[PDB]
Each structure stands twice: as structure tokens, then as C-alpha cells.
Curated annotation (Swiss-Prot), chains A, B:
GO terms for biological process: protein secretion by the type II secretion system. It is found in: Cell inner membrane. It comes from Klebsiella pneumoniae. The chain holds residues 32 to 138 of 140 of the full protein. Residues 89-107 are annotated as: Disordered. This is Type II secretion system core protein G. Keywords: Cell inner membrane, Cell membrane, Membrane, Methylation, Protein transport, Transmembrane, Transmembrane helix, Transport.
Length: 108, 108
């Protein structure tokens, strides 16, 4: 379907945009925001510990996108087994999840 | 270092932007470009099979970024164990790698 394709593109684009903002937060802070801090950490410095350092004016993203069905995206952090995920719940409660965003390596 | 911090932010930002473009390519084609097709497949329809379907005007990214030290970013796809990575070689040949970008799930 056409609407379905467009919705899928929005979900994937938003989740990767959130991923990038979360990675910029982590470069400044050495860790991602926790689920307790939430994606809100990307727009205002978190009140819950661990506190952010050198928080940039305006935060890390211009706005927090919502999914095509009007649900906020959700953050699992630090997550089970230290795997950080960002997901949409979908229209039907079958989550579309961008998994283990922290899987980066230095060296081969 | 100040330059070093800037370079690191650029590498992470670029690699995530490339990740997003690759994911959009995959939504249209059901698979990522292969290493043989390369990141070039994000800017112009790939000459090598498997050919892209209905390739969009302007491709998937305005232009390919280069890393802070003048090297192209590199794509491993489909990769060892089907794990797709995008990386910078670094100034010193110690790669900074955004790993297993295809790790997404449907359902919990
Ligand atoms: Zn990712």
C-alpha cells in the first residue's frame, strides 16, 4: 500500500533522526539518556541523574517527532543486556524497533 | 582536542545520515546496497545487480560526505554474518564503525 509505505518511511526516518540526536547526546555525556530521562533529554537537560554536562542551547533536536498514528516514540536505555532500542508501537501494537543503537566499535 | 571533538561529531553525524539513506534505499528495494554497489548507490542508480527499483529523483542523499581526514566512508554489505557496517578509516587506520545497521525487529 501507498499510505503504508509512507508511514514506514516516516517511522524509519524519525527513528534514525532520534538515533543521531541520541548519539550526539552520548558524545557530550559518555552515555545515552536513560528511559527515566526519556527522549525529553534531547530537548531539555534532564533533571534525573545522571545529569548532562555542557548541555547545548536548544538541546539536540528541534522537535520530537511522533509516529504516524500519533504515539510518541519510545526509548529503552540502558536496556536489557545494555542494548539501547528506540521504537514505534505501530498502529496495532506490533513494535517497529531500531535495535542496539550503541553497537559501534573502535578498531577491527 | 577541539578539532578532535568536532571531527568525532562529524564522523558520527555523517555515519548516521548514511545509515538513514541506506535504510530508505532498503525500504524501496528490500535489501541494502552491496559493497560492490557501494555508498554510490545512494546518489545514482547502481550499475551492478541487483538493480534498484524506481530509483528516486536525486537518490537518497544530496551528496556523499567525506570523513574529516579526506577518506570516503566505507560500506560492508551484506557483511560477515549478514551484519551491515558503515565506517570511517580514521586518521590513523583505527576504524570508527557504526555496526549492524540492519538490526531492526518487528514485534517484541
Ligand atoms: Zn543505527
Amino acid at each position: 500500500g501507498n499510505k503504508e509505505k509512507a508511514d514506514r518511511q516516516k517511522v524509519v526516518s524519525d527513528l534514525v533522526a532520534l538515533e543521531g540526536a541520541l548519539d550526539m547526546y552520548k558524545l557530550d555525556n559518555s552515555r545515552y539518556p536513560t528511559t527515566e530521562q526519556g527522549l525529553q533529554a534531547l530537548v531539555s537537560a534532564p533533571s534525573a541523574e545522571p545529569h548532562a554536562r555542557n548541555y547545548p542551547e536548544g538541546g539536540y533536536i528541534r522537535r520530537l517527532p511522533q509516529d504516524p498514528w500519533g504515539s510518541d516514540y519510545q526509548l529503552l536505555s540502558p536496556g536489557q543486556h545494555g542494548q539501547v532500542d528506540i521504537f514505534s508501537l505501530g498502529p496495532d501494537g506490533v513494535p517497529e524497533s531500531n535495535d542496539d543503537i550503541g553497537n559501534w566499535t573502535i578498531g577491527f
